[PDB]
């Protein structure tokens, strides 16, 4: 009885598969335990340690804070064998401790709560031990590599801190002085410390950017009337025009709005500052995507109307600059609306 349309289930294979995948990453970026089983249930990764390990190091859309929060768990064994698996496909041979830490820190954020930091460091240090045993041998107590890894982290934080005057920052001799007697009473060979200090000074240790990085650089461009949570991702950016009254015409350019669509939130802004190769946006209002519907319309004064509603009833009215931007934006907003609705899990 139902006619075939383009909205029939026979045509939504790709759309629904990709929707589930994005939901999986969304549950990981909120709670990595619920997220990870979600993706093995739907078969996005095998239930293997290296499987989850290959996934966390390569897939985009995963928060590096949330990856480190996961890989840094002592309780779960899988997290430890995924951690040992992630350190396995990182080769630290013919490299100083700081160049190994930098490579390791490129994938996992090494910050936050003392318990889980100690642990990624613990697991990192031993991978550094296995790989360059020789260097370990000129250490009275191999326990000192763990101590030295934290000293490098402490050096990096201090050196590139915006909160310390340059003259109150750690000098090379202050770094050497602080490590005196660290090796169970003996000192670490000084040229090794010269190297370390002399190369963190050349280049700060920085974690690789992720989706949270883009949301926070957008967030710093908005002057409020706090969106960089690890689950939130930027979907699209669009210029629209707001419509106070769709029954009268308006001059072109009036009520110009810059819209930011996130996977669970829609923020409406208006241009604030102007030149210098960018701008700020004065936050006007934001909308939850739950219960929201997009009704496309047009009249004699607005050929490309967009209307946002709910029945949980008109949120706002927009006119798009052209039909293409209209199709693209409404297609993304409808997909983000479906993502949020599907996500309302009732377990």
Same domain, yes or no, for 259 and 329?
A: yes
Alpha carbon distance 8, 10 (integer Å): 5
Alpha carbon distance 302, 179 (integer Å): 70
Question: Could you please report the per-residue DSSP string of 227-238?
Answer: ---TT--EEEEE
Alpha carbon distance 297, 304 (integer Å): 7
113 is a catalytic site residue: yes
Alpha carbon distance 36, 58 (integer Å): 15
Same domain, yes or no, for 228 and 339?
A: yes
Distant-in-sequence, close-in-space partners of 244: CB < 8 Å, separation ≥ 6:
250, 255, 317
Where residue 2 sits, what CATH number does that domain have? 1.10.220.20
Locate all alpha helices (DSSP H) within the chain, ordered by sequence: 13-28, 32-41, 49-58, 64-71, 77-88, 97-105, 114-131, 133-137, 144-159, 172-178, 190-200, 211-219, 323-343
Same domain, yes or no, for 103 and 202?
A: yes
Where residue 221 sits, what CATH number does that domain have? 2.30.29.30
Which one of 33, 41, 113, 204 is the catalytic residue? 113
Alpha carbon distance 55, 49 (integer Å): 10
Last residue of a domain, one of 177, 208, 239: 208
Distant-in-sequence, close-in-space partners of 106: CB < 8 Å, separation ≥ 6:
206, 207, 208
Same domain, yes or no, for 215 and 336?
A: yes
Same domain, yes or no, for 223 and 181?
A: no
159-180: b (≥16 Cβ within 10 Å) or e: beeeeeeeeeebeeeebeeebe
Last residue of a domain, one of 31, 61, 89: 89
Same domain, yes or no, for 215 and 318?
A: yes
Same domain, yes or no, for 204 and 215?
A: no
- Pairing, β 222-223 against β 234-242: unpaired
Last residue of a domain, one of 208, 243, 277: 208
Structure tokens at 67: 């990856």
CA nearest to 337, candidates 316, 305, 308, 314: 308
Same domain, yes or no, for 334 and 235?
A: yes
- Asked if residue 108 lies in contact with residue 120, where contact means CB atoms within 8 angstroms, the answer is yes
Structure tokens at 248: 């009268």
Alpha carbon dihedral 318, 287, 342, 7, in 10-degree steps, equals 0
Structure tokens at 307: 């209307």
What's the structural domain count of the chain?
3
Alpha carbon distance 252, 214 (integer Å): 31
Same domain, yes or no, for 158 and 203?
A: yes
Where residue 147 sits, what CATH number does that domain have? 1.10.1000.11
Structure tokens at 161: 């801190």
Any idea which residue has 């599907």 for tokens? 342
DSSP state of 318: E
Same domain, yes or no, for 189 and 305?
A: no
Gaps (C–N > 2.5 Å) in the chain: which residues precede them? 225, 312
Same domain, yes or no, for 79 and 163?
A: no
Please say whether the dihedral angle defined by the alpha carbons of residues 167, 172, 175 and 176, taken in this order, is positive or negative.
negative
Same domain, yes or no, for 217 and 329?
A: yes
Q: How far is residue 238 from each of residues 15, 114, 284, 318, 328, measured CA to CA in Å?
A: 22, 41, 15, 12, 9
CB atoms within 10 A of CB 295: 12
Structure tokens at 308: 């946002």
Question: Could you please report the per-residue DSSP string of 62-99?
Answer: --HHHHHHHHS-SS-HHHHHHHHHHHHTS---S--HHH
- Asked if residue 299 lies in contact with residue 287, where contact means CB atoms within 8 angstroms, the answer is no
Range of the structural domain that residue 257 is part of? 211-343
């Amino acid at each position: 009885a139902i006619p075939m349309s383009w909205d029939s289930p026979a045509f939504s294979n790709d759309v629904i598969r990709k929707r589930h995948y994005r939901i999986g990453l969304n549950l990981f970026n909120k709670k990595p335990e619920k997220g990870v089983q979600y993706l093995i249930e739907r078969g996005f990764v095998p239930d293997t340690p290296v499987g989850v390990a290959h996934f966390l190091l390569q897939r985009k859309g995963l928060s590096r804070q949330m990856i480190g929060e996961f890989l840094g768990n002592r309780q779960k064994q899988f997290n430890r064998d995924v951690l040992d698996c992630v350190v396995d496909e990182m080769d630290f041979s013919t490299m100083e401790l700081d160049e190994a830490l930098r490579k390791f820190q490129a994938h996992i954020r090494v910050q936050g709560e003392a318990q889980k930091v100690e642990r990624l460091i613990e697991a990192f240090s031993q991978r550094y031990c296995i790989c360059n045993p020789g260097v370990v041998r000129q250490f009275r107590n191999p326990d000192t590599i763990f101590i030295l890894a934290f000293a490098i982290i402490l050096l990096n934080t201090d050196m590139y801190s915006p909160n310390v005057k340059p003259e109150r920052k750690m000098k090379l001799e202050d770094f050497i002085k602080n490590l005196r007697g660290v090796d169970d009473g003996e000192d670490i060979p000084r040229e090794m410390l010269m190297g370390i200090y002399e190369r963190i000074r050349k280049r700060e240790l920085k974690t690789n950017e992720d989706h949270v990085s883009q949301v926070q650089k957008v967030e710093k461009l908005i002057v409020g009337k706090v969106l960089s949570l690890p689950h939130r991702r930027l979907v699209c950016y669009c210029r629209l025009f707001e419509v106070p009254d769709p029954n009268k015409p308006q001059k072109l350019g009036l009520h110009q709005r810059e819209i930011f669509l996130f996977n669970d939130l829609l923020v409406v802004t208006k241009i604030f500052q102007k030149k210098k190769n960018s701008v700020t946006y004065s936050f006007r209002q934001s909308f939850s995507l739950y219960g929201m519907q997009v009704l496309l319309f047009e009249n004699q004064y607005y050929p490309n109307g967009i209307r946002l509603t709910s029945s949980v009833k008109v949120l706002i009215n927009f006119n798009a600059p052209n039909p293409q931007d209209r199709k693209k934006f409404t297609d993304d907003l409808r997909e983000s609306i479906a993502e949020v609705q599907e996500m309302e899990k009732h377990r």
